[PDB]
Curated annotation (Swiss-Prot), chain D:
Self-association state and partner proteins as the record states: Homohexamer. Homopentamer. The prolate capsid is composed of pentamers and hexamers of the capsid protein.
Organism, scientific name: Bacillus phage phi29
Listed name of the protein: Major capsid protein
Family: Belongs to the phi29likevirus major capsid protein family.
Location in or out of the cell: Virion
UniProtKB/Swiss-Prot annotation, chain F:
Subunit structure: Homohexamer. Homopentamer. The prolate capsid is composed of pentamers and hexamers of the capsid protein.
All copies of domain BIG2, residue ranges: 345-424
Disulfide bonds: none
Naturally occurring in which organism (per UniProt): Bacillus phage phi29
Protein name from the UniProt record: Major capsid protein
Subcellular location: Virion
Gene Ontology CC terms, in alphabetical order: T=3 icosahedral viral capsid; viral procapsid
Pfam families: Big_2
Family designation: Belongs to the phi29likevirus major capsid protein family.
Keyword field: Capsid protein, Coiled coil, Late protein, T=3 icosahedral capsid protein, Virion
Cited InterPro entries: Big_2
Keyword Cytoplasm included in the entry's annotation: no
Organism lineage string: Viruses, Duplodnaviria, Heunggongvirae, Uroviricota, Caudoviricetes
UniProtKB/Swiss-Prot annotation, chain G:
Compartments it resides in: Virion
Domain of life (superkingdom): Viruses
GO BP term, example: virion attachment to host cell
GO cellular component annotations of the record: viral capsid, fiber; viral procapsid
GO molecular function, a single term: identical protein binding
Subunit note: Homotrimer. Forms a super helix coiled coil in the homotrimer.
Record family assignment: Belongs to the phi29likevirus major capsid fiber protein family.
Record keywords: Host-virus interaction, Late protein, Viral attachment to host cell, Virion, Virus entry into host cell
Cleaved signal peptide residues: none
Protein name: Capsid fiber protein
Biological role stated in the UniProt entry: Protein that forms the 55 capsid fibers. These fibers are not always present and may have been lost in some lab strains. They may enhance the attachment of the virions onto the host cell wall.
UniProtKB/Swiss-Prot annotation, chain H:
Location(s), subcellular: Virion
Protein role: Assembles to form a prolate capsid shell of about 54 nm in length and 45 nm in width, with a T=3, Q=5 symmetry.
Organism: Bacillus phage phi29 (Bacteriophage phi-29)
Official protein name in the record: Major capsid protein
Subunit structure: Homohexamer. Homopentamer. The prolate capsid is composed of pentamers and hexamers of the capsid protein.
Family: Belongs to the phi29likevirus major capsid protein family.
BIG2 domain mapped to chain residues: 1-50
Residues shown, of full length: 350 to 399 of 448
Length: 445, 112, 97, 49, 50, 435, 111, 50
């Protein structure tokens, strides 16, 4: 029990509203003058926190009773539940497969006399995901202690279910912040294709340039021809306009819809900038907004159980709801960051084939994909680090394996940026497994 | 924990630093004197003639009334009425703050 | 057939997010402090580039298997395919009058 | 923000969370309050360590 | 020896066949794009100076 | 997880089969030189302990999968299960009551004059069997985490099955281990009737000498005359050829089939007559075979129940298979041990009443039975505790006067070596009460 | 219990640590030579990295040895947070119950 | 010919323990004492003898 608690518990009034209606002499409160019970609504119309007991007016000994009991059913969805994929009952690892395009090869019926059976290998890039999140939620409900707050089994069992829903709400809160982390993860790894801007809040116009760099990017992602320019594997892929999502801060999206007048009447369009999924800000310091694909989130469910326990001594239950999930992103599936302020000039060097089984004495053409923020050409130092047996690469990325290597070597594509005083060696890296051949030789010409 | 009986001899207030003395066949307790190292901390009001107990246990930290504003990491000693106050004289330090406290608020402390 | 390989392969970590949430005292990673399995999500949540065998967490002699294989089906189009005309089986020349 | 209750507390408290804004010589105190009901344990407290 | 299901072994073959069909879309874009740059080179576009 | 593991991980090679096929002039590997993939087979031929990820040969980006998972279901039994007796649901102890034969008295009608109402108790002997084994097998199945290691619900239920069957194969193993403990325990107490014989695999005539000591003794057990020898408690029991069991090992089984039972024209003239339970072997240093009765094993069941539980915070079942069991041996039934090596000269000394009840100033006679592996080892020396200076044991008779202590009768046989006769002796004891 | 610490400069595991204060959060660094340390690192901690201090009052610590320590030797801080023998009371924070060479961990009882 | 160590595939938490059980395949009756050793360790990591 409690006593001595007034209706002013935690309330710091700016002006007393009941003097103002009392002292109103042609003032702006003058329409509250003809209200009959004005002084009663002002006392407990803000709600009562502690529940004082109230005697009845006619018969003082009777106590006015609690009438309706409202149990709030407020739900907390994930904003990104539409990006979550199916369920995986068994296994742990997911395997992506993307088969890229090939070249054109002019029809020539004289070259066809010998080039039957020509062995062109398809260009498949694979990508692996494993289960990451593994956590549980926890409510205790004391059933018999809650039978004193509830006079009907409707209101009692409705409140029990509102504790289960708070578990279900707690899942889609943390599933949000996990999926929000993967954007903060992927940009911290340097796997976004960044698009440098000025700080949009610095001026109008700087806003208007930012809507240009989003509307231009969005059409570039949804070009049907596709491009190797907008994912961190640099295969040639497209997106769709309905499946493109602009994940943006609430404050930044507020600026664009009012100031940049073109975006204003293009709200309730799904195709001006894709589907704008307003969230709050990103934990990364520069990341202003992100266009992203529907196939970006490789988010899968593994386990949704609510196992229960009952303590007989305590006369309660424990409700243990387990949520197991794969929470990773596809390095396919076009994804664009929009980053203000200071950026590196080059953010990523994507080395094609990043995985190679190359024969002893064989060769393999590698290609770098320098993702620069500015419009500048950048020199790729190809290297072979690792190995022990004198293998070397050419200046354009043709590997040449030294015939008796017998050691795993990794192939790096270095793009030095910055100046020579602090050389910022942005390095992309492939790997090569050296297969034996049992070949003769040792010197040429 | 190891409990034993002790008698207050001077209006013990909760969350105050306590000292003790040898009394009439019993350990008597009271608020620790200013500028020293306390032995026990109150966690119940026990009046001048009241008899109570002490629960012995190597506690990592105590929660006591701040005798003045305290900054995180401040070395603390006894102050007026057995409250904890900031200092700089090692010989009177009994612990240090791990959290901010304003005068009259509780401050968690770690013993040294 | 690969030996020692990392999960950071072509990864240029402009900042480490694990050390960013760890060293966070209210600098915008405060929303990740009550996040339970944060370190293991940010470890391999960029899509491991080269697969490595994961042993089972309870019985260690078992192999956690590949469960689902998602073969991507991106269909690249010609945006001008709506500009194509019919098909000419026989002959070579078109005469437009 | 961690209330710690004495082993013989016996009446109704009020915690206060005071944000001092405004003038050094006019402290405009904004105070959020809560109410605590102290319920007994019958445990043998006293002193520690 | 990289599949355990025929439904996934067939679906990777079809992703290799559709990769060939995707290649015939990428080139045909470029040849129909070339016909524009041919026609502007040969000067048969009615030009508006901007 | 398991970064850099060779395929020859826990392998100590003797010779490199890669190089010995390659050095083809060694004229024994010449038939492997035609084999065009000899190096691939002889690398992963023994199997892989670690499962390195193998890339696909055609498209390196892909990963070569697992095709087939085999659960290796095994069911192992108890050889000594046919010695178990039954189950005892209620109550704990087992009392086994034997009634030995009496002593012939001379007719003597002169001294029959005053002894008409002489009371003469039988030689009734008992021994008790409490419940010994009280144990449980613990197995956690953390089932939701084992879903990662399987892609079918057929292999997944077949694996939870084999964990449960692994809990039953422990109750078949450890039940067998305690029952060979009861033979090594009994031999360690000195309670067998030790028989000296060389190792039968020494010169193959000591196998023949061993079968002569098995078919002598197995006749000597089942003579209808009975015998005071061939068991502890030293009663006169007889046994039956059907109720005899022999234990030998798989070493004496095969040596007898090769060296004796195949050369012999009549196999029944050299068949260890008894029943033979072929087991592993005994952990005592010389104990080769044990010839024994059927009712020697007092092994009774008390509890066999599976109890499961589930932890909903860690998502696992937890299987407690309890096994409570009475595991003892019976000293009344015959038991012969067939021991190589050096033995003590006297195995034990049996004091023929084990508990008495004598009044203050009563009169009990006590009797010693020496076990005596040699041809002669004698001279029982009789003593008594209980510290009252009128009490006296003398040859056999116990005086036992108005001292009122629980005295115990300690006899002695001096198996000794010269001046090592200060420690070296073998005792037997009885307990004597008052009134 | 535990509390948040902000480290200070490259904390190494098993080394003796000492607390300070700066901006707010308690700062942790290797304890200075010839004194009494406050905490033992359980893991390596980067210069400005926040972490926890597990206050579970221990009667004994496992600390890296900076020099040859014999059984019963009184210990104090050495260089770089290592533990070394001392013959000067007040620098003593505990004593060894184990013998250790150099760079090896040694169990010591705090006193 | 062989020394079979029983938990071949061990995953031990930091500060944890595993018991290791060497099964020496001897071709005689002689006994052979197993010497235990850790490779790849740091300070604080060893096998205690058995």
């Amino acid at each position: 029990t409690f006593n001595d608690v007034k209706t002013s518990l935690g309330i710091t009034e700016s002006y007393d509203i009941v003097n103002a209606i009392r002292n109103s002499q042609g003032d702006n409160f003058k329409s509250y003058v003809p209200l009959a019970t004005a002084n009663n609504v002002a006392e407990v119309g803000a709600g009562i926190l502690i529940n004082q007991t109230v005697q009845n007016d006619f018969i003082t000994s009777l106590v006015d009773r609690i009438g309706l009991v409202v149990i709030r059913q407020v739900s907390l969805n994930n904003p990104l539940k539409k990006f979550k994929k199916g369920q995986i009952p068994l296994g742990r690892t997911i395997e992506e497969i993307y088969t890229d395009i090939t070249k054109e090869k002019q029809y020539d019926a004289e070259e066809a006399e010998q080039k039957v059976f020509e062995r062109e290998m398809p260009n498949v890039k694979t990508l692996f995901h494993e289960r990451n999140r593994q956590g549980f939620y926890h409510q205790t409900i004391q059933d018999d202690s809650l039978k004193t707050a509830f006079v009907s089994w409707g209101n009692f069992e409705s409140f029990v279910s509102s504790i289960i829903n708070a578990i279900y709400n707690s899942a889609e809160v943390d599933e949000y912040e996990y999926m929000k982390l993967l954007v903060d993860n992927y940009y911290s790894k340097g796997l976004f294709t960044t698009v440098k801007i000025d700080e949009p809040t610095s001026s109008t116009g700087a806003l208007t340039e930012f809507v240009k760099k989003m509307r231009a990017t969005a059409r570039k992602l949804t070009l049907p021809q596709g491009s190797r320019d907008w994912n961190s594997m640099a295969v040639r892929t497209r997106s769709y306009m309905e499946d493109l999502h602009l994940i943006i801060d609430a404050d930044l999206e507020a600026e664009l819809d009012v100031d940049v007048l073109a975006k204003a009447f293009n709200m309730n369009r799904t195709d001006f900038l894709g589907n704008v999924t307003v969230i709050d800000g990103f934990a990364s310091t520069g990341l202003e907004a992100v266009l992203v694909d529907k196939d970006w989130f490789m988010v899968y469910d593994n386990l949704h159980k609510m196992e229960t326990v009952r303590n007989p001594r305590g006369l309660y239950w424990n409700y243990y709801y387990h949520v197991w999930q794969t929470l990773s992103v596809s390095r396919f599936a076009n994804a664009v960051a929009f980053v203000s302020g200071d950026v590196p000039a080059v953010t990523q060097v994507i080395v094609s084939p990043n995985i190679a089984a190359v024969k002893q004495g064989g060769q393999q053409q590698f290609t770098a994909y320098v993702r620069a923020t500015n419009a500048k050409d950048h020199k790729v130092v190809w290297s072979v680090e690792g190995g022990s047996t004198g293998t070397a690469i050419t200046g354009d990325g043709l590997l040449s394996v030294s015939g008796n290597e017998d050691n795993q070597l990794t192939v790096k594509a270095t793009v030095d940026i910055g100046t020579e005083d602090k050389p910022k060696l942005v390095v992309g890296e492939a790997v090569v497994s050296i297969r034996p051949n049992n070949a003769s030789g040792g010197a040429q010409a | 924990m190891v409990s034993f009986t002790a008698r207050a001899k001077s209006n013990v207030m909760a969350y105050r630093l306590l000292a003790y003395s040898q009394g009439d066949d019993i350990i008597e307790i009271s608020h620790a004197a200013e500028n020293t190292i306390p032995d026990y901390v109150a966690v119940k009001d026990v009046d001048k003639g009241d008899l109570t107990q002490v629960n012995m246990y190597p506690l990592a930290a105590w929660q006591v009334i701040a005798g003045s504003d305290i900054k995180v990491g401040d070395n603390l000693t006894t102050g007026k009425d057995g409250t904890a106050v900031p200092t700089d004289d090692p010989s009177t330090v009994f612990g240090y703050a791990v959290e901010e406290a304003q005068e009259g608020q509780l401050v968690t402390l770690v013993i040294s």
